[PDB]
């Protein structure tokens, strides 16, 4: 399986590990030199919360597995039962997760009140609709 290329993480059962077996719907041979730093997997994006940087519903998001991210970076973050993709603004014991769409509102997370962890760092996008 290690030589099948990047796993494609499709739909994601609430509270479940991102790379759980039952989530990997595909695999694509993608050059490792393509993304910096290296992609470890591809995450299908949902919704249009990031359309303004061109990360559209349906796009495959190259994600580098790490918990080491900075403010200003597009993170993949787990909040209680959910996983989202946003620009990170950390601020004391309050973490903001910023959309790239004016129709969307920043998610504001209280670290005392909710489990918040970083799943990885978005390093690239692959779009492969049948119609562009």
């Amino acid at each position: 399986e290690e030589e099948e290329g990047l796993p494609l993480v499709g739909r994601v059962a609430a509270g479940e590990p991102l790379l759980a077996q039952q989530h990997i719907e595909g695999h694509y041979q993608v050059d490792p030199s393509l993304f910096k730093p290296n992609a470890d997997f591809l995450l299908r994006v949902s919704g249009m919360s990031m359309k303004d940087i061109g990360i559209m519903d349906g796009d495959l998001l190259a994600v580098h597995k790490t918990q080491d991210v900075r403010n200003g970076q597009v993170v993949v973050a787990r909040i209680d039962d959910e996983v989202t993709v946003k620009r990170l603004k950390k601020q004391g014991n309050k973490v903001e997760l910023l959309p790239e769409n004016s129709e969307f509102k920043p998610i504001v997370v209280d670290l005392r009140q909710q489990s918040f962890t970083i799943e990885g760092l978005a390093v690239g996008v692959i779009r492969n609709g049948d119609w562009l």
Partner: nanobody, 122 residues
């Protein structure tokens, strides 16, 4: 309906030792990677250590590597954090997590215990 319970926390002097334990109840334990996270005051919760389902592989946060070891006991449904050379940096709520390993890396899910407080002082 997985239920996790951390224990073993307390107050410890710098350079000392301490052992955390987690009891997992509503799961098929042999089938899951287990991990320890920690959350220090006003900071993002980070993974400290993880172990694959049968313990073949582990992960460690760089700053606890060589100081902390994780292990699990499949007969007893527990996972444990042996903490040596405690620094003040180590002060946090420690949480037990259920997750899964893929290509040598722990990916976690959203089940947590209530947490156990570790405080390092002099």
């Amino acid at each position: 309906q997985v239920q996790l319970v951390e224990s073993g926390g307390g107050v410890v002097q710098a350079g000392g030792s301490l052992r955390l334990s987690c009891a997992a109840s509503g799961s098929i334990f042999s089938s899951n990677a287990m991990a320890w996270y920690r959350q220090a005051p006003g900071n993002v919760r980070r993974l400290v250590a993880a172990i694959s389902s049968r313990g073949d592989n582990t992960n460690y946060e760089d700053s606890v590597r060589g100081r902390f070891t994780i292990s699990r006991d499949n007969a007893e449904n527990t996972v444990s954090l042996q903490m040596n050379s405690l620094k003040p940096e180590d002060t946090a709520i420690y949480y037990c997590n259920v997750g899964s390993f893929y290509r040598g890396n722990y990916y976690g899910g959203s089940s947590w215990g209530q947490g156990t407080q570790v405080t390092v002082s002099s």
